């Protein structure tokens, strides 16, 4: 018995039922690593209470919550079995789930990993493409936790901090696309537009030099290479409400514009968040989707299945943890470089934490 | 002997001497592909006159003009010699240059192509990454030339409309970066930040769905992957014009940003225009580069050589022309899809011109 290697699976998490929405949002609007608001401690609870009902309504439209915990566990369980065979010298592997905004929280998972007396811990982001708002907040949590608790790790840390072009991730995307194309009529299959859709960033975050848009773009091109460019594609970005500029084209405006220009068959691909999540206006709202079919004659909008829903995804995850171990790296080279216009002093602390680890 | 296969090398061109600046600009501000303004016929010749001295001054700072013609013709001469040997069956290949804004203008080269009575013509964009402002405007000039002159083509047209990840383009970038890294002190080499720098696009063009940022990003990933991620990198965007929002991070602000955060060694890479072109503020203005070395202590900012240049670039060009011929495609799949929010009626006209060619 006793676990020697721990794999901390990091992700923002998601409310498992609609009652969880308030506290998910509370911890989100309190995240300094995500966004800076004046008097943040006092605004958060309020914004969180004002938006709980719209976000419960959105989660109701998709089954009443997020499956991310159950899917992450099961991928975790499957990654372990494969690792136990793959890397016998790192021996009993154990996965922990570290969500940023919901239980099991990142800090909770860190405590438990210490109590378990692990030999090595691996901060394994579940976001293939790095943004400071996602992977960087989760890594910043791991450092803000030793700095809060006043103590030093009792295990050796490393991080798998991005994997935007990992060959089995790319093969899972291409498989899910092929499968979904098979649901359009055969005579039409040729004309289906592949719209890769990733969550957008505000332009001020893009302009400070966030690495995310470039890495999402790289995953897109690998996928299309693997598909031998069989259909035409675009990368668009699911933006939102507020009147701050975000990186576009926006998913909803692109769908409408595509339909206005004669493209009636559209395949949406969630290229940057591997679990089920809130869907778009044309997927959800029937008067919109009605206006659209009547004005432009939309024939089919389909969304490809989430990866974190697969099997061979486990094989992707284990294969990464295993190359990471073979390679003896502490973090990717990219993590050694802070954004050109970074204004968050913890970023640099989190970087030295990882690059300075024993081993 | 007597030419059967014409290769029209398309590019914006550049003023060969400061004398040429005015007319370069005039034709640029009159390009309705590219940009629309009110009273365009009347506004352009003005804007052209107003900006001419600024732009003469910029070209003075880089040797007194653009060497694109000589470099393009020399690359063309070398693509032709290898094409003749690679594909005997497409016979006497001949290269034409078709610049958008300076002689030999694209319509001029189409006329001469028509008189040479070629069998097949290949619109071969010299921009590896597609934007509707660059490659699209050039393809659009070809269609608007036949619609101008109210006649149908006398040869079979096809297009190489983008090549952002061509394996030899990628190998030239990588070789050029390695050679420039060799110019930094051995002790510092691993600290050098690679800043890929591509010309920016205005946000309203990004938000209508231009393919360019995603393709430039794909080229960047392929290069760093060939270099095995030896240094850290970012993709930033240069040479923004006017006060509208353009896609950032800005190259200038990123260089300043990086130095105020301790990165003293910076290798800039022209990732998206293969010829010498106007350089950035920190490379040109000394009172700025002075403030910067005094306040942040910059050690070395260097810029990799243009693909220009190299002879394995001619090999890249020949190989692409030769794969195109072997493949029998008329255009890429991506070209059959207009931007989601395209508002240019000619775009669709240009697509079906290419997709509809005999053979
Ligand atoms: C600084 C950049 C970002 C900001 C400011 C931001 C903002 C927000 C906010 C405010 C919410 C809570 C829901 C709401 O009030 O509407 C949210 C939820 C969410 N964000 Fe972001 N976000 C950012 C980046 C990202 C990125 C890069 C990703 C994906 C890789 C992402 C994925 C999500 C997901 C999955 C949710 C849960 C709700 C849903 O399923 O759509 N976000 N975000
Ligand atoms: C719609 C998007 C674009 C607009 C509106 C635009 C605007 C301009 C303008 C106005 C000029 C003349 C110089 C001046 O007056 O300052 C110029 C020059 C130039 N543009 Fe663009 N540009 C765009 C996109 C691009 C792209 C995608 C490239 C890609 C490689 C590019 C490459 C150049 C080059 C090489 C010059 C010559 C001056 C120099 O060397 O920088 N441009 N552009
Ligand atoms: C005003 C400022 C804009 C950027 C900034 O100030 O940092 C923003 C950032 C978050 C904003 C608050 C949040 O945007 C939520 C509120 C939305 C209201 O309709 C506008 C005010 C509102 C209470 C905002 C007040 C003010 O506009 C804040 C605090
Ligand atoms: C969308 C979100 C909350 C919902 C809303 O009020 O629209 C609002 C409130 C807080 C806002 C963010 C915060 O004010 C902090 C950031 C400030 C930057 O100048 C723009 C992006 C930035 C990240 C904001 C963008 C956007 O308007 C946010 C994220
Ligand atoms: C470390 C080793 C060095 C020799 C090589 O490049 O093959 C190579 C082989 C596989 C390479 C890795 C893979 O290409 C995938 C990863 C890509 C990430 O963005 C950086 C680290 C990343 C993990 C790579 C780093 C490193 O250069 C690796 C591990
Ligand atoms: C905003 C407006 C056009 C509307 C649009 O296309 O978005 C812009 C586009 C280019 C502008 C013109 C050009 O920038 C050249 C001139 C610059 C001067 O500072 C003002 C007048 C001037 C003659 C501009 C007037 C006006 O601002 C124009 C015509
Ligand atoms: C850079 C130049 C400024 C010239 C001057 O002020 O002397 C201006 C003149 C015409 C402008 C363009 C045109 O107005 C058309 C476009 C309108 C969009 O809202 C911004 C980008 C857009 C493509 C403009 C970018 C830029 O401001 C241009 C190119
Ligand atoms: S905001 Fe990107 S490194 Fe800090
Ligand atoms: S502007 Fe992109 S296709 Fe017309
Ligand atoms: Cl043809």
Task: Walk me through what this model shows.
The structure is a homodimer of 359-residue chains. Chain A folds into two domains: 1-163 and 307-359, Rossmann fold, CATH 3.40.50; 164-306, 3-Layer(aba) Sandwich (Rossmann fold). In chain A, the strands form two sheets. Chain A has a four-stranded parallel beta sheet, sandwiched between helices. In chain A, strands 6-5-7-8 form a four-stranded parallel beta sheet, with helices on both faces. Chain A has helices at 21-29, 40-60, 68-86, 106-115, 132-149, 167-181, 203-207, 212-226, 251-260, 281-284, 286-296, 313-327, 345-355; strands at 5-11, 93-99, 120-125, 156-160, 193-199, 233-238, 265-270, 300-303. With 359 residues, chain A is of the alpha/beta class. In chain A, helix 1 (21-29) runs antiparallel to helix 2 (40-60), helix 5 packs across helix 13 (345-355) and helix 6 (167-181) packs antiparallel against helix 12. In chain A, 48% of the residues are buried. Chain A is globular, with a radius of gyration of 21 Å. The structure holds protoporphyrin IX containing FE (HEM) (2 copies), cholic acid (5 copies), FE2/S2 (inorganic) cluster (2 copies) and chloride ion. One FE2/S2 (inorganic) cluster binds next to helix 5 of chain B.
């Amino acid at each position: 018995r006793k676990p020697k290697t721990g794999i901390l699976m990091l992700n923002m998490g998601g409310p498992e039922t609609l009652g969880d929405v308030h506290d998910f949002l509370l911890r989100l609007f309190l995240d300094r690593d995500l966004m800076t608001l004046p008097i943040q401690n006092k605004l958060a609870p309020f914004i969180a209470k004002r938006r709980t009902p719209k976000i419960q309504e959105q989660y109701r439209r998709i089954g009443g919550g997020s499956p991310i915990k159950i899917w992450t566990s099961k991928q975790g369980e499957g990654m372990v079995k494969l690792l136990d065979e793959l890397s016998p010298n790192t021996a009993p592997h154990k996965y922990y789930i570290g969500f940023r905004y919901v239980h099991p929280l990142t800090e909770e998972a860190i405590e438990e990993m210490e109590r378990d007396g692990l030999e090595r811990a691996i901060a394994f982001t579940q976001y293939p493409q790095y943004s400071c708002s996602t992977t960087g907040s989760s890594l910043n949590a791991i450092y803000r936790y030793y700095n809060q608790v006043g103590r030093k790790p009792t295990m050796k840390w490393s991080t798998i901090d991005r994997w935007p072009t990992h060959h089995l991730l790319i093969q899972c995307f291409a498989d899910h696309i092929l499968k979904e194309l098979d649901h359009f009529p055969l005579e039409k299959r040729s004309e289906v537009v592949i719209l890769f859709s990733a969550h957008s960033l505000p332009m001020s975050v893009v302009n400070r030099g966030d690495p995310y848009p470039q890495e999402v773009s790289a995953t897109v091109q690998k996928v299309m290479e693997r598909l031998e460019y069989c259909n035409p594609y675009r990368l668009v970005w699911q933006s939102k409400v507020g009147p701050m500029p975000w990186l576009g084209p926006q998913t909803d405006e692109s769908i409408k514009g595509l339909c206005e220009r004669g493209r009636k068959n559209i395949l949406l691909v969630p290229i940057a968040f591997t679990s089920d999540h809130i869907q778009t206006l044309y997927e959800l709202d029937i008067e919109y989707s009605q206006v659209l079919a009547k004005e432009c004659g939309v024939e089919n909008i389909r969304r490809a299945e989430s990866l974190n829903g697969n099997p061979l995804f486990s094989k992707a995850l284990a294969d990464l943890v295993h190359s990471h171990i073979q390679s003896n790296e502490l973090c990717s080279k990219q993590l050694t470089l802070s954004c050109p216009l970074c204004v968050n002093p913890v970023c640099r602390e989190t970087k030295s934490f990882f690059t300075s680890q024993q081993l």
